[PDB]
């Protein structure tokens, strides 16, 4: 019983984090095989003006690099720039490289972040890529390069490299192919993200989790058609209802159809009247159906 | 920027989790040195009624154990009962044993739980020991023996071994010394926990984190003295304020004294009124001074 924000174990990933230093700039890198991945701004000559990375890369001198794994130095033999990432080729192959793949997150997908600060992991937490392509993380200077991952089918999927913090406090990263999520730039200039949207499928999953844990004071009998809910959502900051696949499975299991939950969302969006649901005082879109089913049924969708 | 409930890395602990099988039961154990620690009920043959652990231990046979690390079987050479825990001596030392110590959690302290099942870690999350000595975790059958830990000063402090789930869904564990938190028993009969209280010290830390970020719509100028606040707390389900000195760094950085936050607590307890603080719609007591200062300033 119970439902709590959880992170997948960090062991496999911790052994891949290294300290990358170029000149006076220090940040984190991910060492897989004989390549160390890190944000390209590690070579930026400044952090106050617009950066011309083409020029920056042309004047880059490899002897300025210092890469440390634990207490050992890695030997740099080359480096190439890909989008907002740098791929540094070293002589050493990380013997702890887990079976892995690289994937690009979709809107609303959940993953894990290993917050690192000098090539050393300090914390781990689960997060979701929001519809505005930013995440609600917690970072301080030095967190750049921190990796985002998911453990699946016996391997590690690398999906996020921390890059910047917007004026709003929201965080943005890039995939390992160098593509910044949301199209944000790795420049100091002011950048504003679009309005965030509540993830409807996650809210529905959260309500089903409440039902499975014996919390149903809010549950009523009225039903709301998906087509109609979607009209409301588009105008009230909520994403459209979709999936339904795993949802139909839960609807059958609990005997409570999705329509009843969509009606509840529409109502609960006005307030909980002082009551709580699984420890929360307002609708929560942090848990996906995947997390809910894994935590309560022990199965992976 | 930001404030997120985090867990400390699980790397050093994952390597110590083993599967402990005895008769018709399977749960998790913690392998440190040449000892495997686990809940003693793993030897309970029948759990339909009261368990006579002294009797259970007297009939226990070492050959009925099967301890597996990853894919390897460990040789059992002995086993003793300490409180609600079993200390199983094996024939080999865990080469991955980290620098460690054992500590017993006090009311309201935070730690990390590595949720394990068939002797394999599946999830990790930070949690706090509540005033009623239970934790609001997330587990399914097979999680018994999952360890709770804290990383500090270059070593791993083992503080919790998962033991039971109450009818309310609350979770209870024991220290590695074999003392069950809250005095709960590893018996089948119904057991009920006491009323929980909001951890004032954590709520204060939460408000400081709010200020450090751009959220201060709730901040007023009135000062509520500790003495007066504790009077209100005792009658409203909150713990008493303590260690005001500890908040020195946060108060100095924000320019806001604890007294003003105690006043805010008393007021915000009546409701936020549609507004949110760091994304929450009600007071939060999940973050300690330690967590906030670490996430805000990177200081331990």
XYZ file of N, CA, C and O in Angstrom, chain B residues 128-196:
276
model
N 10.528 10.587 6.149
C 10.800 11.025 7.508
C 10.100 10.093 8.482
O 9.015 9.580 8.196
N 10.733 9.868 9.625
C 10.142 9.048 10.672
C 9.134 9.995 11.308
O 9.506 11.064 11.800
N 7.862 9.621 11.282
C 6.828 10.482 11.845
C 6.786 10.412 13.368
O 7.377 9.518 13.970
N 6.105 11.370 13.990
C 6.029 11.406 15.444
C 5.356 10.173 16.043
O 5.574 9.853 17.212
N 4.545 9.481 15.250
C 3.873 8.282 15.736
C 4.684 7.033 15.382
O 4.191 5.905 15.463
N 5.935 7.261 14.988
C 6.885 6.203 14.652
C 6.568 5.285 13.479
O 6.946 4.111 13.482
N 5.882 5.822 12.480
C 5.546 5.074 11.274
C 6.033 5.939 10.124
O 6.340 7.119 10.320
N 6.122 5.366 8.931
C 6.523 6.154 7.774
C 5.472 5.959 6.697
O 4.815 4.918 6.640
N 5.301 6.978 5.864
C 4.338 6.930 4.777
C 5.119 6.488 3.549
O 5.530 7.307 2.731
N 5.353 5.185 3.445
C 6.097 4.673 2.315
C 5.212 4.121 1.215
O 4.010 4.393 1.154
N 5.828 3.355 0.325
C 5.111 2.725 -0.769
C 5.770 1.372 -0.946
O 6.931 1.284 -1.357
N 5.031 0.322 -0.611
C 5.554 -1.033 -0.697
C 4.463 -2.012 -1.093
O 3.272 -1.735 -0.951
N 4.885 -3.164 -1.595
C 3.956 -4.229 -1.918
C 4.602 -5.441 -1.263
O 5.737 -5.354 -0.792
N 3.891 -6.557 -1.202
C 4.450 -7.732 -0.561
C 5.819 -8.093 -1.119
O 6.059 -8.002 -2.324
N 6.714 -8.489 -0.223
C 8.053 -8.868 -0.623
C 9.088 -7.818 -0.278
O 10.280 -8.053 -0.453
N 8.639 -6.666 0.222
C 9.554 -5.578 0.566
C 10.199 -5.714 1.946
O 11.085 -4.935 2.289
N 9.763 -6.688 2.738
C 10.353 -6.865 4.062
C 11.870 -7.015 3.984
O 12.405 -7.737 3.135
N 12.561 -6.313 4.873
C 14.009 -6.369 4.885
C 14.652 -5.218 4.130
O 15.877 -5.070 4.192
N 13.853 -4.422 3.411
C 14.388 -3.277 2.662
C 15.052 -2.347 3.656
O 14.481 -2.028 4.705
N 16.271 -1.894 3.339
C 16.997 -1.004 4.241
C 16.759 0.490 4.099
O 16.465 1.002 3.012
N 16.892 1.175 5.228
C 16.753 2.616 5.282
C 18.144 3.089 5.651
O 18.795 2.480 6.500
N 18.600 4.171 5.026
C 19.951 4.662 5.268
C 20.098 6.165 5.114
O 19.203 6.851 4.621
N 21.263 6.651 5.536
C 21.638 8.051 5.414
C 23.131 8.070 5.128
O 23.885 7.277 5.697
N 23.555 8.949 4.231
C 24.975 9.062 3.906
C 25.494 10.277 4.655
O 24.870 11.335 4.644
N 26.633 10.130 5.313
C 27.178 11.246 6.061
C 28.638 11.033 6.405
O 29.039 9.942 6.799
N 29.429 12.088 6.242
C 30.851 12.040 6.560
C 31.609 10.877 5.920
O 32.519 10.310 6.525
N 31.231 10.522 4.698
C 31.916 9.447 4.005
C 31.542 8.038 4.423
O 32.260 7.087 4.105
N 30.431 7.888 5.139
C 29.999 6.559 5.552
C 28.488 6.397 5.450
O 27.748 7.374 5.363
N 28.044 5.148 5.444
C 26.625 4.838 5.342
C 26.078 4.479 6.723
O 26.581 3.566 7.383
N 25.066 5.216 7.166
C 24.436 4.936 8.450
C 23.174 4.132 8.157
O 22.272 4.630 7.490
N 23.119 2.896 8.639
C 21.943 2.052 8.433
C 21.016 2.281 9.617
O 21.387 2.041 10.772
N 19.803 2.738 9.317
C 18.841 3.106 10.349
C 17.466 2.450 10.321
O 16.672 2.637 11.252
N 17.167 1.686 9.281
C 15.837 1.100 9.190
C 15.806 -0.200 8.400
O 16.470 -0.329 7.377
N 15.033 -1.161 8.897
C 14.846 -2.448 8.237
C 13.334 -2.582 8.154
O 12.655 -2.596 9.181
N 12.790 -2.680 6.947
C 11.339 -2.767 6.825
C 10.760 -4.048 7.418
O 11.247 -5.146 7.141
N 9.699 -3.897 8.212
C 9.083 -5.038 8.892
C 7.598 -5.285 8.633
O 7.194 -6.410 8.331
N 6.782 -4.247 8.764
C 5.345 -4.426 8.601
C 4.556 -3.257 8.021
O 5.060 -2.146 7.861
N 3.298 -3.543 7.703
C 2.373 -2.547 7.188
C 1.138 -2.649 8.078
O 0.606 -3.740 8.277
N 0.697 -1.522 8.629
C -0.471 -1.508 9.506
C -1.759 -1.450 8.697
O -1.736 -1.167 7.503
N -2.882 -1.720 9.359
C -4.169 -1.701 8.684
C -4.468 -0.375 8.010
O -5.258 -0.312 7.068
N -3.833 0.686 8.494
C -4.026 2.022 7.945
C -3.158 2.246 6.710
O -3.328 3.231 5.989
N -2.217 1.337 6.478
C -1.336 1.476 5.334
C 0.006 2.056 5.741
O 0.937 2.102 4.939
N 0.106 2.506 6.989
C 1.352 3.076 7.489
C 2.396 1.973 7.585
O 2.063 0.813 7.810
N 3.661 2.340 7.423
C 4.732 1.357 7.454
C 5.613 1.465 8.681
O 5.905 2.560 9.159
N 6.022 0.303 9.178
C 6.852 0.217 10.366
C 8.056 -0.687 10.142
O 7.960 -1.728 9.483
N 9.192 -0.279 10.698
C 10.404 -1.063 10.572
C 11.126 -1.091 11.905
O 10.594 -0.638 12.916
N 12.343 -1.615 11.912
C 13.117 -1.691 13.144
C 14.509 -1.151 12.891
O 14.892 -0.907 11.747
N 15.274 -0.960 13.958
C 16.643 -0.509 13.794
C 17.407 -1.806 13.522
O 16.841 -2.898 13.615
N 18.676 -1.712 13.154
C 19.423 -2.934 12.920
C 19.831 -3.598 14.236
O 20.460 -4.654 14.247
N 19.442 -2.974 15.346
C 19.711 -3.522 16.673
C 18.559 -4.466 17.020
O 18.610 -5.202 18.005
N 17.507 -4.432 16.208
C 16.372 -5.302 16.456
C 15.240 -4.659 17.234
O 14.320 -5.349 17.685
N 15.301 -3.344 17.406
C 14.246 -2.639 18.121
C 13.247 -2.083 17.112
O 13.612 -1.295 16.236
N 11.990 -2.502 17.225
C 10.963 -2.025 16.307
C 10.618 -0.589 16.673
O 10.447 -0.266 17.848
N 10.540 0.282 15.674
C 10.186 1.670 15.938
C 8.741 1.701 16.439
O 7.896 0.936 15.968
N 8.469 2.561 17.413
C 7.124 2.673 17.948
C 6.696 1.555 18.884
O 5.621 1.629 19.481
N 7.520 0.518 19.016
C 7.170 -0.587 19.894
C 6.159 -1.557 19.302
O 5.608 -2.404 20.011
N 5.900 -1.430 18.004
C 4.964 -2.317 17.323
C 5.531 -3.734 17.343
O 6.741 -3.918 17.446
N 4.663 -4.736 17.251
C 5.126 -6.122 17.273
C 5.039 -6.804 15.914
O 4.190 -6.459 15.090
N 5.932 -7.758 15.672
C 5.895 -8.497 14.416
C 4.968 -9.692 14.618
O 5.367 -10.850 14.515
N 3.717 -9.365 14.922
C 2.662 -10.339 15.162
C 1.483 -10.024 14.239
O 1.326 -8.890 13.778
N 0.631 -11.023 13.968
C -0.541 -10.885 13.096
C -1.739 -10.100 13.624
O -2.561 -9.631 12.839
N -1.854 -9.961 14.938
C -2.989 -9.239 15.505
C -3.000 -7.771 15.089
O -1.958 -7.189 14.796
N -4.191 -7.181 15.056
C -4.352 -5.783 14.675
C -3.620 -4.850 15.632
O -3.658 -5.041 16.849
N -2.950 -3.849 15.068
C -2.213 -2.854 15.843
C -2.541 -1.489 15.258
O -2.608 -1.337 14.035
N -2.728 -0.496 16.121
C -3.050 0.852 15.659
C -2.011 1.878 16.106
O -1.533 1.846 17.238
N -1.678 2.793 15.204
C -0.698 3.832 15.484
C -1.363 5.031 16.162
O -2.583 5.178 16.122
N -0.550 5.884 16.779
C -1.056 7.082 17.436
C -1.289 8.172 16.395
O -0.943 8.018 15.221
N -1.886 9.275 16.834
C -2.148 10.397 15.949
C -0.816 11.031 15.571
O 0.080 11.161 16.401
N -0.689 11.418 14.309
C 0.532 12.041 13.823
C 0.464 13.549 14.070
O -0.620 14.120 14.170
